[PDB]
């Protein structure tokens, strides 16, 4: 039930599917800071430099491991959790 644990790019702008990064902080979590990607446009930026609604900006999600102060605020004990973070965006053709 419990285990002992020891301790050890301008892509967002340049993208065809650009994204905004929103800082997410919790001092009670490790990592304490995660930046999350939110797709700027619904479509995609083309050669001309405008939103092509033929394509779509989609965020690329990832199930990440995080630690949390369990009991709440207890600074020595932790619980392992799995959160779904969006790292960036890609441009896809519909299905």
């Amino acid at each position: 039930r419990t285990v002992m644990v020891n301790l050890n790019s301008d892509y967002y702008n340049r993208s065809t599917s650009p994204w905004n990064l929103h800082r997410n902080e919790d001092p009670e979590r490790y990592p304490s800071v995660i930046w999350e990607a939110k797709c700027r446009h619904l479509g995609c930026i083309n050669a001309d430099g405008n939103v092509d609604y033929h394509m779509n900006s989609v965020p690329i999600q990832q199930e990440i491991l995080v630690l949390r102060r369990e009991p709440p605020h207890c600074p020595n004990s932790f619980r392992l959790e799995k959160i779904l973070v969006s790292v960036g965006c890609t441009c896809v053709t519909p299905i």
Partner: antibody
Amino acid sequence: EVQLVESGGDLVQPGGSLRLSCAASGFTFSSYWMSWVRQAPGKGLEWVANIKQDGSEKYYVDSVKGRFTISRDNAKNSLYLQMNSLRAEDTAVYYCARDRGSLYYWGQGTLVTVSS
Amino acid sequence: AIQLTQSPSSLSASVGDRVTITCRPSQGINWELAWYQQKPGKAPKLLIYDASSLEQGVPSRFSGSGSGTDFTLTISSLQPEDFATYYCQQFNSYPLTFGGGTKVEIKW
């Protein structure tokens, strides 16, 4: 861009009062925690107060516990600092910042002067 | 509270040098430490979080390290645009505290 703009800071005699005002913009002000850190003339940083998303929890440094009052108006996009019985030690630049533990988003600061 | 002892309080250095600032908390902390840079007339910039993690935008020439009672901020190759006061701050428990700062001054 996220924007934090302080105001209210002015010369006020000791014992007096003043209300700081941090004007937030560029984010869902209602979803994030806020803070106030001070810098006394030629001195280091000193964490002062922080307030929860809604306004249910609030934490302080003991040098301002009972004297200072932190508040928020999530509809207005404003963080406040109602300070009272102002001392010499209370003359600093008051910066407001977003989040609680590691502050990335900082305001420019507001000088509160308290003297004779 | 958890008192942060910063070492040294001031230091002279030249462009290209390797600056090593140390932060030592009064008690024991896991990773709950942050580093900042402050230049005259500006609000502090956050450099490193969780004692070792580089923040968004912060250049590669910055390292953060250590655990428990020994924390290290390191500028491998000093730049002119790097002379400032550096603060360390714990977020282990309230009241949140700052170190006294370290002046990375110019050695004439």
